[PDB]
Symmetry: C2
Subunit: 316 residues, 2 copies
């Protein structure tokens, strides 16, 4: 039986590859909702792409419809505006404009526009029959909000939280005149939120930091393989998302949910930098002999990842 | 019977929409060759995308194969590097990786790699039975080279030259610390070439300058229309190219070749600025009562353009 999952994402290309991996595998995953944050997207576009993917899968493979909520979380440190257009472009793609999916999403949008993302995440987790696995591919703001508001009433219902973020033993990816390059973007967008979640004693966290993700490159040679499966809508989707160095990033979180044996898990105590200095957002190893915060993913299987993505994208 | 056409392009998204319009309409156009210049692309990528589009149409609608040549022209003023990756991304798209097309292009590439673009343009025009219409969607360097080398032996064989470039009564699009914004990129890439061609007395030129192109917007509402025709490879291609303000630009040159009644044609004498000052590349109206250089396109039909693109992209 399927794991109960919520995808808490921020609407860039890799977020949607993650969504597709989860939604295309109903034998393993029951996707009960999605949250979209105004981080590496413009939230209205991320919301619409989420809706249309949901509608396409409902049509093709009969996965249930689910609630989708826009978070009202605001950036501590915003993503570069230029990067945030990915969902806008995706929303114009022919594979996201099949007439039946556009028509159904028009009908479903009003009810979903009404949801508050943070409250939806809380409600879905707290009202769920089984414990919920939360896949976090944007910043940690929504998880933090839930922990702050509800504490153990929320955390007791989380099976595990699988997170794309941080950089432990390698450099970061936040390169700005005001930064040193040690921080990773998802953490940097809201460092206090990351500190609240990663160091929370009552949540089992698995962290896909740049350490693991940057060992799984997405290369042209790999991407070209979707052409042989162009008959499948999901191959049109993922092949285009990847064709638009580049790593698997957010997609590895969903891959781990599908197949936890994709990676080694190493316990590490982290100390999230919430200062306003050059190292803001850094997730270094904590000094001293403190209780580890999280399992950090190590040396994920490139082969298992490839096999999983290519199989998933032949589903429809 | 079909017009004999050569497409002299520089391998960005709009260049390929132009190519698709021409190649998808064999009743109106016999595409006898393509030239690719290292301007708004990396030439190897532009070359490969040209090859695969050629192979896909040969497969689906039995259009003949034709020679493809990489020009060795070098920039006077290069395009921004970031913009030049479009063909690289397109080459990874699933619609440009159908196994039969990849296989055929592997076989055809060695013979085509050998061609020199400039000499191929000259040879194709001079050896053609009927006069040739040359569609120019990159810089004018190849046309200039042919005129310089062969003079009337070349120009006497050109039916007309339909060119994307310039800005006559409106601002340009070249915004650099060293420029005033009055110039358009295709001209700016090689101003002496543009001066040689546009002012040549023995070539009939039709110029799609920003004046005309910037009255034909490519809007999300329009682009979304390809979803309803996702079953067609060419709709996957064009819808994606446009989904990746934005105007029809290069595609209007091919549209005019297909349907010359798409636009009003106004005679204008131009004086191309080849200086190294802020106005380098500008194509202002010439002072005095001089012989007009070209017919400048005016107020192209948005409706005819739409109808033509959508019909062409249902061909296969
Ligand atoms: Ca993300
Ligand atoms: Ca061009």
């Amino acid at each position: 039986m399927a794991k109960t999952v919520i995808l808490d994402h921020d609407g860039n290309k890799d977020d949607f590859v993650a969504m597709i991996l989860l939604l295309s595998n109903p034998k393993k995953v029951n996707l009960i909702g999605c949250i979209c944050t105004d981080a590496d997207c413009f939230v209205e576009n991320g919301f619409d792409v989420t809706g249309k993917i949901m509608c396409a899968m409902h049509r093709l493979i009969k996965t249930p419809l689910f609630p989708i909520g826009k978070s009202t979380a605001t950036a501590v440190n915003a993503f570069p505006t230029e990067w945030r257009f990915s969902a806008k472009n995706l929303d114009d793609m022919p594979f996201l404009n099949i007439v039946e999916d556009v028509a159904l999403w028009e009908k479903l949008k009003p009810e979903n526009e009404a949801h508050n993302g943070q409250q939806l995440l809380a409600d879905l987790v707290m009202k769920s029959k089984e414990k919920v696995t939360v896949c976090v591919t944007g910043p940690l703001s929504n998880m933090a909000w839930c922990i702050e508001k509800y504490g153990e009433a929320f955390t007791s219902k989380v099976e595990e939280c699988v997170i794309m973020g941080g950089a432990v033993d390698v450099g970061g990816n936040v390169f700005l005149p005001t930064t040193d390059g040690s921080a990773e973007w998802n953490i940097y967008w809201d460092p206090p939120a990351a500190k609240k979640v990663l160091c929370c004693p009552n949540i089992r966290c698995v962290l896909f930091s740049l350490d693991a993700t940057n060992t799984v490159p997405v290369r042209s040679v790999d991407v070209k393989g979707f052409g042989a499966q162009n008959q499948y809508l999901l191959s049109q989707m993922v092949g285009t998302m990847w064709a638009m160095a580049y790593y698997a990033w957010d997609a590895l979180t969903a891959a781990y949910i599908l197949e936890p044996t994709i990676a080694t898990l190493e316990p590490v105590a982290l100390d999230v930098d919430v200062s306003k200095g050059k190292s803001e957002g850094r997730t270094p190893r904590a000094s001293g002999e403190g209780k580890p915060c999280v399992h950090v993913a190590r040396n994920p299987s490139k082969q298992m990842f490839h096999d999983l993505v290519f199989a998933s994208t032949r589903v429809c």
